[PDB]
Ligand binder design. Sequence first.
Ligand SMILES: OC[C@H]1O[C@@H](O[C@H]2[C@H](O)[C@@H](O)[C@H](O)O[C@@H]2CO)[C@H](O)[C@@H](O)[C@H]1O
Ligand SMILES: OC[C@H]1O[C@@H](O[C@H]2[C@H](O)[C@@H](O)[C@H](O)O[C@@H]2CO)[C@H](O)[C@@H](O)[C@H]1O
Lengths: 134, 134
Amino acid sequence: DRAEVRNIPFKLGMYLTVGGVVNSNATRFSINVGESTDSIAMHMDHRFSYGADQNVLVLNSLVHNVGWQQEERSKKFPFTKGDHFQTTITFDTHTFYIQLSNGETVEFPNRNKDAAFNLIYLAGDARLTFVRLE
Amino acid sequence: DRAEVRNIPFKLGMYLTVGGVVNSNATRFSINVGESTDSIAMHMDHRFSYGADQNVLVLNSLVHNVGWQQEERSKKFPFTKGDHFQTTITFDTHTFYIQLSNGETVEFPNRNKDAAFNLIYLAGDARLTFVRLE
Ligand SMILES: OC[C@H]1O[C@@H](O[C@H]2[C@H](O)[C@@H](O)[C@H](O)O[C@@H]2CO)[C@H](O)[C@@H](O)[C@H]1O
Ligand SMILES: OC[C@H]1O[C@@H](O[C@H]2[C@H](O)[C@@H](O)[C@H](O)O[C@@H]2CO)[C@H](O)[C@@H](O)[C@H]1O
């Protein structure tokens, strides 16, 4: 199915580093941190070609039985199809701090002010090769 | 549910370190490396009190739609209910190499000669607090 880390709580102060490989001919893939596949506090989508979006990062949250909220977009896109990537995420109750493969960072609001998350997963056209959550 | 790391391949040469806490009044808990909850190549059960077994490690494999194979048991048991533990696992095509919190080791045959595993999970009376698989 998708690559999942489930019920190993990602809590305030811990760091999550995932590494993987983008597929050749990838459309998009995302890293999702939340509660379930329908309850995502930080959705980070990497769009190689999706609709009108080409080489952009789109960040958003998904509320259970409600839907996607306000998107934030970033133009920082050090990603290449067929290549490796590595991303580190930490958060406090106000902000998710994300660091990309090249050291550039992107910040996204912790909109629900959650202190722990029990599901981390990747979906779309990429695969994970390692994870550290500590 | 249980603590799971799914579809992030654990391959020949990589190391898996999981850390957690044993519940107070724990009966037993296990760390399972395999393909599914019905297909486990290395089952490591930690028995505080289970039947006639008290403070013993039991290792075995579970074959899909067949069942448990020959058990191997170890008397090394540096575990205390309510306390933390940390375990490191690597394997080659013949052997799973397991290192316990106190540095003692236990070895178990890789009975199917598998080179990669797509499910790592914990079940029973413990919880995981961190994982590194790299
Ligand atoms: O916001 C994350 C969310 O985006 C959806 O796509 C949006 C698209 O970004 C937007 O430009 C357009 O107006 O509406 C689309 C549908 O809501 C994705 O479908 C979804 O998977 C998430 O990635
Ligand atoms: O071997 C792992 C497997 O053990 C089962 O328990 C065994 C028990 O170890 C043995 O002494 C007894 O004779 O038979 C029991 C049932 O097969 C557990 O039930 C199972 O969960 C695994 O842990």
